[PDB]
Amino acid sequence: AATDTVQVGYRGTAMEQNYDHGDLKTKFAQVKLPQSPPPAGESPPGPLPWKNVQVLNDISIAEFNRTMIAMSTWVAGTGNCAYCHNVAAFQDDTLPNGKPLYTKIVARRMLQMTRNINGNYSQHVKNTGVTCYTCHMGKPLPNGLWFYSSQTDYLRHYLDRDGARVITQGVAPSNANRSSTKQAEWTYALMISQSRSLGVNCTYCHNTRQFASWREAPPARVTAYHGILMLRDVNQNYLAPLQPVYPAVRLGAMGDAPKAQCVTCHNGAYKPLYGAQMAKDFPAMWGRADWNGVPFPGI
Amino acid sequence: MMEYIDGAQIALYAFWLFFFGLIIYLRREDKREGYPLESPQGPRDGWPKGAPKKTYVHRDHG
Amino acid sequence: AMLSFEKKYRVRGGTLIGGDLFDFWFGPFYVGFFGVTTIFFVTLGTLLCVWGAAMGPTWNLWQINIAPPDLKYGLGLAPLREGGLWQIITLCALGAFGSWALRQAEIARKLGMGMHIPWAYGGAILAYTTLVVIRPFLLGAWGHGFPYGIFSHLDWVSNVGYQYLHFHYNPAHMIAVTFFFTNCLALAMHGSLILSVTNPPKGTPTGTSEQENVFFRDLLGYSIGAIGIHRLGLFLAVGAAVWSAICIVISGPFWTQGWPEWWNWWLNLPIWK
Amino acid sequence: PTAWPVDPTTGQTLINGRPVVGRVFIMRKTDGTVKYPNVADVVAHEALAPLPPVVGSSYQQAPITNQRRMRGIMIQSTLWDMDRKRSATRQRYYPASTPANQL
Amino acid sequence: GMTEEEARRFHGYMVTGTLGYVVVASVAHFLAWSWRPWF
Amino acid sequence: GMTEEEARRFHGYMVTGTLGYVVVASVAHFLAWSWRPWF
Amino acid sequence: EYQNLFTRVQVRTVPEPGIPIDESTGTRYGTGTFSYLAGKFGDAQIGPIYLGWAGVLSLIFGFIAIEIIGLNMWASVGWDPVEFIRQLPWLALEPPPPQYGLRVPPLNQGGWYLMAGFFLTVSIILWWIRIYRRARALQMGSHLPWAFASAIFLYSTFFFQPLLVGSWSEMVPFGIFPHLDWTSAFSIRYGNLYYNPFHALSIAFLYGSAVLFAMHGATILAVARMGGEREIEQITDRGTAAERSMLFWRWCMGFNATMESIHRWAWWFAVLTTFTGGIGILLTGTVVDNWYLWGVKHGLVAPYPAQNQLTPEQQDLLRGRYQGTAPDSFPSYVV
Amino acid sequence: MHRIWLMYDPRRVMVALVGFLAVLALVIHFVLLSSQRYSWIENGTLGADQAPVGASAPAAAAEMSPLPPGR
Amino acid sequence: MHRIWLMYDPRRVMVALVGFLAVLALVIHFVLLSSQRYSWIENGTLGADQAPVGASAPAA
Amino acid sequence: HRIWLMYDPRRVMVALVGFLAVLALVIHFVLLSSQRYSWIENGTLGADQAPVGAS
C-alpha cells in the first residue's frame, strides 16, 4: 500500500509522479521474466548468396541469420520460421499454392519501418531504439491497434490531423485564436489518452498553471511532440498502406488497416519495456551509421 | 492606446472601492449595540462611528 | 475599552492551564496562557515568513513563495534555504492554530458557553493538518505540502489536481463541493429570512418566528425551525471541511490512477455488468 | 566574468583590484529565481505562436453507422476506454438505415 | 448487578464456550494446514 | 470504591494473567525466531 | 454537557400552523403533517406549499426543460433503460457546434439544447417572481429575492458570455460529469482560471461563507441553552445569550457583530460569491483571453527556475497549429 | 476470576463478543482472499507445491528502472 | 438452553438472523459470480476439468 | 499496589486491553508490509531464502 513518488519539477509545484508500489513491482517483474535474450553475434567474410533479399542487403550472412532468429522469437515464438516462410524455399514470397505469404511481405515492410523509426526519429527513440519486440512482445498482434470509427475520434491526431493548440499566446482576445471550449475538451480527451499510454499524469509534460508553456514544462514534452510526428509517418506511410496485404480478418469495419498509437510501444510505461536497450544489439535494425558511437558493421 | 490599464484591472478597482465601502457600512451596523464603549478616559466610539440604536415596533394582534 | 454591558462579565476563572497568572485582558482581547503562546507562534511564524520573502526574488505580495523541500529529503528537516524554513513555519502555524483553538475554549468557559466554536474550528485545523502533516507523512516526504505563497499555492492546487488527470471525478471531492455550495445557499436563505422579518418595509410591524417558518416552509416544503437552521449551517460548513480533508488524503496515499477510472466499479455492478 | 579574478600568489579572490579574505561566492536569491519582467519576455522564451487552423472547404457527412449518438466531447476517454460491455458498445453508433425499396 | 452464584454460573458457560470454539478453530487450522501450509 | 482487600484479590489475577500473556508471547517470539531470525 | 445537536423530546400539536398567515390570492396546497425524522434534527412539520400563477407556470416550464434533457440523454443510449441508469452521470444534452455561431442549429445538434435552456431560464425567472410575491404577501423585506437574484446573475453569465464571444457552442452541457468536463475545459481554453482575480475573489467569499456559517452556527448552538436561538427576540429584546455571543468574539478577535448585523455579514458574503463570479465569467474571453498572461502582466505569477530551455529552431519546430475541423473522410493510403 | 462479570450485563457481553468475532473472521478471510497464495476461489485446487510463493528476490537488466528518472 | 429466549426477545433475534443470512448469502453468490472459476451463468456447463484455474507458481 | 485505588481497575482493564490490541495490530501490519516478514506470501521460505535489506 506504499506509494512511490518521483519529483519531476521544482520544489512545491507538485509536479510529481505517483505509483502504487505493489502494482508497479508486478508490472515490472512481468516484463523482466519474459524479456527475450539476444544471440551473441560474429564476424565472417564472404559475398551474399541471397535470392530475394531487398532490405537486409548491408549485413553479413551471420548477422542476417542472427536477425532471423530474433524476428522469430520476437514476433512468432522462437524458431518459428514457418510463420513467415515456405520453409522449403525461404526466398519464396508465396505458398506452394501460389497464394502469397502475407506475413513475409508485411515483415519486409516492418523492417523498413523499424529502420525508419530508429534512423529518422532518433529525436524520439534516442539510443534506446525499437525492435520488433517493442510492439509485438512475442505475439503477432501488438497492443493498441485502432481503426476508423468516427470523424471526431482523437486517435486521428496520429494519422491525418495536425493542430491541437487552443490557448492564446497573448493577454487579449484576437482573431488569431478562435478555438472553442469544445476543442479544449477534445485536446483534454487526447491528453488523458497520452497520460494513460505512458502511465504518467499531466505534470510529466506540463506545469499545469500554463499548459502552453514549454519553459515551465519538463523536457519530456519535447520528446512527446516528436512522438506525434513519428506516429504520423508510421501510420501514413507504413501501417495504413498495408490494407491490400492483410487478410480481411485483420482489417477494420471500414476495411482499413490497423494503426498504431503511443500505447503500442509504451504499453503503460514511461519508456517501452521500462527502457530495456535492445536495438544496440541488432545492427540490422539501426537504420543509422553508428549506434552510440559503435559503428555499423557493414559487410 | 493604454498598454497597462485594461478592463479587468478597472473592474477590480471598482470592486475594491465598493467592498471597502461595504465593510464600513457593516461596521456601522455592528455598533448598534454595546456602544459607545466604556473606558477610563470616557466614552469611545472607535471607527467608523456606529449607527444609532434601533427601536422595533411590535404589532397590535389579530 | 469595554462594551457598555461588558464589565460584569470579566471574572477570573475558566482557564485550562495558567490559572490567574495570565487571566487578564489587553484592550478588547482576552489573553490567557494560550494567548501568550498564540502571539509567540504568530510573531515567530510571521517574521520567518518575512525572512523567506527577503531571501526570495521579490517583495511583491502576490509573488512571495516559501516552498517546501525536495522530496529527496523525506521526513528530515532540509537546509533552511532549501525548504527547512517552510518546515519551521509549518511548526509555528500548527502551534498558532492549536493555541487559538484552546484560547477559544478558555473564553467559552469564562462565558458559560458550550464548546461548539473550538470544535467547529477544529474542522479547519484538521484540513490544514491533513494537507501539511498527514498526507505528506503517508506519502513519506514533507515536500508534499503546499507552498506558502498567495498564488504559488494555487499552482500547487492546480498540479495536484492534474496529478489525477481529472480531479472533478474524485467522489469525496464531489461531496465536499456539494457541501460548500449547499452551505452558501443555506447561509443566503438564513441571512435573508432574519433580515426580512427584522427589516420589513417601512410602516410594517416587526415580524415573528411564525412568518419566517411559514416562508421557509413553502420554500423547501418543510419548516426547519430556529435551532434546526443553525445545526444545518454548522453541519454543512464543517462537513465541507471534513470531506475536503477526506478527498485530499485519499488522493495519492490510497488512490494513484486517474480519478475517472475509479468509477469502473459502478459500470461493473453485476445487475448490468 | 562568471567569477572574479584570482591572485596567483595566494589563490585569493580580487574584487575591484583588492583582495577578499574568504571563499567568494556569487550571491543569488532562492534557487536563482528572478521575477518575470513582462509578458513579452515570458513569451520570448516560449515557442512561436501556433499556425492557423486547417479548415475544410465544405462538409461531407459520414455514413450513419459512423455517427456517434453521444455528442459529449470527452466520452471516448472518460467512459469508453474503460467500458467494455457489448450492449453499451453497440449503442454507441446509429444502426444502419435504408430506404425500403432498396432492400 | 448479579449474585455471586450467577457470575459463577455465567463464567462456566463463557469458559466452556470459548474453549469449544477454540477447539473447532483448531480443527479448521489442522485442515487448512493439511491443504496449504503457511510456514 | 475499591478496598485494599479487593485490590489484593484483583492484583493476584492481574499479575498472573500478565505472566500467562508474557509466557505465551515469549513462546510465540521463540517460534518466530527459530523460523526467521531478525538479528 | 448537552450539545444540543438533536432533540430527544418532540411535542405535537393537533391543530397546526401551515394554514398560512393571511395571504390573499393563490391557494394553500395540501394539509400539514409531522415527520418524526424531521423533528429529530429540526422542526417536525412537513406541510403546505404556495404556488400562485408564477409558481404553476414555473413548474410547467421547468418540467418541460427536465423532460427535454432526460429524453435526449435516454435517446443518446439508444433508449436502453439499463444503460440509461448505468451511464446516467456521463450522459449529456450538448450545446450546438461552434460553426453556427449564434444561428439556430439543427434539432439533434443543439436545437434541443437551446430549447431546454430557454425553458429552464423562463422557469428560473418565474420562480424568482414567485418568491418575490410571497415575501411581500407575508409582509417581509425583499432580502431573499435579491439574494436569489445574485445566483441568477451568475447563471445568466453562462448565456451572456457565450453570446459575447459569439457562439452557443461555448454554453454548458446539461449533464453531471459533462458539465464538469466543461468547467475544466473552460479554465484550459482561457489559460488557467486561478489567475482570474474575480474567480479568486469568488473563492474568498465562498470560503468566507463557510467560515461565517461555521462560526455563527456554533455560536448560536453554544448559547442556545440561554435562549440564543430565539434570534428575533435577542434582536428586539437583547438577552444574556446575545451579550455573551458578542463578548466571545470581541474577546477572541478584538471585534464583534450584533445578533442582527451578523446576518448582514452572512447575506453579503453569500451574495458576493456569485456576483464576483459572474463578473469574472463575463470578463473571460471578452477582455482577457489568457488569465495567466494577465497575471504575468499585473505581477501575480511567482517565478520558478526554468524546467526546459528551447533553442531558436525548436521555437519554430514546436509551435503547433490551432485545432481545426475533424477529417470528414476515411482516406485510403494504398498508393 | 468470575467476579470480572459482576460489572457487566451478560446479554450485552455476548452481543459485544459476537460482533468482535464476526469482524475479525471477515478481516482474516478478505486478507487471505486478496493474497496470491491463498486466493482459494480461483486457485484452491492447486497442490501445495504448485501454489504461489512470494519472490525470494526480484531482478532487472541494468538499464531498466521501474520508476521514471527525476530528482 | 431454551432459557435464552427469556433473556432475549425471540421476535427481534429472528428478524436479525434472517437479515444476517440474506446478506451473507448474497455476498458469497456475488463473490463467486465475479470470479473466473465460478462465473456459473456464463460457464456453468463446463466440466470440472475444463473450468478456469488461477495461475500456479512457475516452479523455477 | 494502591495504584488500583488511584485508578479504577475497570477503566484500566479496558484501556490496557485496547492499547495491547492497537499495538498488536500495528506490529502485525508493519511486518506484513515488510519484505522479510510478508509471511502470507513468503512464509514457507527458509531463513536462508528470506529477503534481507542491502548492506
Ligand SMILES: CCCCCCCCCCCCCC(=O)OC[C@H](COP(=O)(O)OCC(O)COP(=O)(O)OC[C@@H](COC(=O)CCCCCCCCCCCCC)OC(=O)CCCCCCCCCCCCC)OC(=O)CCCCCCCCCCCCC
Ligand atoms: C478579499 C476578501 C476579504 C474578506 C475578509 C474581510 C474582513 C473584514 C473584517 C475585518 C475588518 C474589520 C476589523 C475591525 O473592525 O476591527 C475593529 C477595529 C477597532 O474597533 P472599534 O470598536 O471601532 O474601536 C475600538 C477602540 O475604540 C477602543 O479599543 P481599545 O482602546 O481597547 O484598543 C485600541 C485599538 C486601536 O485600534 C487598532 O489597533 C486597530 C488595529 C488594526 C485595525 C484594522 C486595520 C485593517 C486590517 C488589518 C491590517 C493589518 C493586517 C496584517 O485596538 C483594537 O481595537 C484592536 C482590535 C481590532 C483588531 C482587528 C484585527 C483585524 C484583522 C483583519 C485581517 C484582514 C486580513 C485580510 O476597527 C478599526 O480599527 C477600524 C476598521 C475600519 C474598517 C476596516 C475597513 C476599512 C476600509 C478602508 C476605508 C478607508 C480607510 C479606513
Ligand code: BCL
Ligand atoms: C460432560 C461433562 C464434561 C466432560 C466430561 C468428560 C468425560 C467424563 C470424559 C470426557 C472425555 C473426553 N473429553 Mg470431555 N467433558 C466436557 C467437555 C469437553 C470439551 C469442551 C470443549 O468443553 C472437550 C474438547 C472435551 C474433550 C474430550 C476428549 C479429550 C475426551 C475423549 C472423548 C472425545 O473425544 O470427546 C469428544 C468431545 C468433544 C471434543 C467435546 C465435548 C462434548 C460433550 C461436552 C460431551 C463430553 C463427554 C464425552 C464425549 C463422554 C464419553 C463417554 C464416556 C462413557 C464417559 N470435553 C464437559 C465439560 N469428557 C473422556 C476422556 O477423558 O477420555 C480420554 C471421558 O471419559
Ligand code: BCL
Ligand atoms: C479546472 C477547473 C477550474 C475552475 C473553473 C471554474 C469555472 C469555469 C467557474 C468556476 C466558478 C467557481 N469556482 Mg472555480 N475552478 C477551479 C478551481 C476552484 C477551486 C479550487 C479549490 O481549486 C474552488 C474552491 C473554486 C470555486 C469556485 C466558486 C467560487 C465559483 C462558483 C460560485 C458558485 O456559487 O457557484 C455555484 C452557483 C451557481 C452555478 C449558480 C446557480 C444558480 C441557478 C439559478 C440555479 C438553477 C437551478 C435550477 C432551477 C435547477 C436545474 C435542474 C437541472 C436542469 C436538472 N474553483 C479551477 C481553476 N470555476 C464559477 C465562477 O464564478 O467563475 C468565476 C465558474 O463559472
Ligand SMILES: CC[C@H]1c2cc3[nH]c4c(c3C)C(=O)[C@H](C(=O)OC)c4c3nc(cc4[nH]c(cc(n2)[C@@H]1C)c(C(C)=O)c4C)[C@@H](C)[C@@H]3CCC(=O)OC/C=C(\C)CCC[C@H](C)CCC[C@H](C)CCCC(C)C
Ligand atoms: C471548518 C469550516 C470552515 C472554517 C471554520 C472556522 N474558521 C475559523 C473558525 C471557524 C469555526 C474560528 O473560530 C476561527 C476564528 O476565530 O475566526 C474568526 C477561524 C479562523 N479561520 C480563519 C481563516 C480561514 N478559514 C478557512 C476555512 C474554514 N474555516 C473552513 C472552510 C480558510 C481557507 C479555506 O482558506 C481561511 C483562510 C481565520 C480568520 C481564523 C483563525 C485565526 C487564527 O488561527 O489566528 C491565529 C493565527 C494567526 C492570526 C496567524 C498565523 C500565522 C502563521 C504563524 C504563519 C503563516 C503560516 C500560513 C500557513 C501561511 C499560509 C500562506 C497562504 C498564502 C497559503
Ligand SMILES: CC[C@H]1c2cc3[nH]c4c(c3C)C(=O)[C@H](C(=O)OC)c4c3nc(cc4[nH]c(cc(n2)[C@@H]1C)c(C(C)=O)c4C)[C@@H](C)[C@@H]3CCC(=O)OC/C=C(\C)CCC[C@H](C)CCC[C@H](C)CCCC(C)C
Ligand atoms: C447566493 C449564492 C447561492 C445561491 C442562493 C440561492 N439559491 C436559491 C435561492 C437563493 C438565495 C432561493 O431562494 C431559491 C430557492 O427557491 O431556494 C429554495 C434558489 C434555488 N437554488 C437552486 C439551485 C442551486 N443553487 C445553487 C447555488 C447557489 N444558490 C449559490 C451557492 C446551485 C449550484 C451550486 O449548482 C444550485 C443547483 C434551486 C433549488 C432554487 C431555485 C428553484 C427553481 O428555480 O426551480 C425552477 C423549477 C424547476 C427547475 C422545475 C421543477 C420541475 C418539477 C420536478 C416538476 C413536477 C411536476 C409538476 C407539478 C408539473 C406541473 C403541473 C402544474 C399544473 C402544477
Ligand SMILES: *[C@H]1O[C@H](CO)[C@@H](O[C@@H]2O[C@@H](C)[C@H](O)[C@@H](O)[C@H]2O)[C@H](O)[C@@H]1O[C@H]1O[C@H](C(=O)O)[C@@H](O[C@H]2O[C@H](CO)[C@@H](O)[C@H](O)[C@H]2NC(C)=O)[C@H](OC(C)=O)[C@H]1OC(C)=O
Ligand atoms: C508462389 O508463387 C510465386 C509466383 O511468383 C512463386 O515465385 C516464383 O519463384 C520466385 C523465386 C520468382 O522470383 C518468381 O518470379 C516466381 O518465378 C513461388 O515460388 C510460389 O510458387 C508456387 O506458385 C506459383 C504460382 O505462380 O502459382 C507456381 O508457379 C506457376 O507459374 C510458373 C510460371 O510463372 C510455372 O513455372 C509453374 O509451373 C506454375 N505452377 C503452378 C502450380 O501454377 C509454382 O509452381 C512451380 C513449379 O514452382 C508454385 O511452387 C510450387 C512448388 O509448385
Ligand SMILES: *[C@H]1O[C@H](CO)[C@@H](O[C@@H]2O[C@@H](C)[C@H](O)[C@@H](O)[C@H]2O)[C@H](O)[C@@H]1O[C@H]1O[C@H](C(=O)O)[C@@H](O[C@H]2O[C@H](CO)[C@@H](O)[C@H](O)[C@H]2NC(C)=O)[C@H](OC(C)=O)[C@H]1OC(C)=O
Ligand atoms: C478525406 O478528406 C478530408 C477532407 O479533405 C481529409 O481531412 C483533411 O485533413 C485534416 C488535416 C483536417 O483535419 C480536415 O479538416 C481536412 O482538411 C482526410 O484526411 C481525407 O483526405 C483525403 O482526401 C482528401 C480530399 O479532400 O478529398 C485529399 O485532399 C486532396 O485532394 C482533394 C481532391 O480529392 C483536394 O481538394 C484537396 O485540396 C487535396 N488536399 C491536399 C492537402 O492534398 C487528401 O489527399 C491528400 C494528399 O491529402 C486525401 O488524403 C489521403 C492520404 O488520401
Ligand SMILES: COC(C)(C)C/C=C/C(C)=C/C=C/C(C=O)=C/C=C/C(C)=C/C=C/C=C(C)/C=C/C=C(\C)CC/C=C(C)/C=C/C=C(\C)C(=O)O
Ligand atoms: C495484520 O495481521 C492480521 C492479518 C490482522 C492477523 C492478526 C490478527 C490478530 C492480531 C488477531 C487477534 C485475535 C485475538 C486476540 O485476542 C482473538 C481473540 C479471540 C477470543 C477471545 C475468542 C473468544 C470466543 C469466545 C466464545 C465464542 C464464547 C462463547 C460463549 C458461549 C457460547 C456461551 C453462551 C451461554 C449462555 C448465553 C448461557 C445460556 C444458558 C442459560 C441461560 C442457562 O442455563 O440458564
Ligand SMILES: COC(C)(C)C/C=C/C(C)=C/C=C/C(C=O)=C/C=C/C(C)=C/C=C/C=C(C)/C=C/C=C(\C)CC/C=C(C)/C=C/C=C(\C)C(=O)O
Ligand atoms: C514503530 O515502532 C514499533 C514497530 C511499533 C515498535 C515499538 C513498539 C513499542 C514502543 C512497544 C511498547 C510496548 C509496551 C510498553 O510497555 C508494552 C506493554 C505491555 C504490557 C504492560 C502488557 C500487559 C499485559 C497484561 C495482561 C494481558 C493481563 C491480563 C490479565 C488477566 C487475564 C486477568 C485480569 C483480571 C481479572 C479478570 C480480575 C478478576 C477478579 C475480579 C474482578 C475481582 O476479584 O474483583
Ligand SMILES: COC(C)(C)C/C=C/C(C)=C/C=C/C(C)=C/C=C/C(C)=C/C=C\C=C(C)\C=C\C=C(C)\C=C\C=C(C)\C=C\CC(C)(C)OC
Ligand atoms: C420520461 O421522463 C424521464 C424519465 C425522461 C425524466 C427523467 C429525466 C432525467 C433523468 C433528467 C436528468 C437530468 C440531469 C441529470 C441534468 C443535469 C444537469 C446539470 C448538471 C446541469 C449543469 C449546468 C447547466 C447549465 C449552466 C446550463 C445553462 C444554460 C443556459 C443559461 C441556457 C440559456 C438558454 C437560453 C436563454 C435560450 C434562449 C433561446 C433562444 C432562441 C434565444 O436561443 C438563444
Ligand SMILES: [Fe+3]
Ligand atoms: Fe442566525
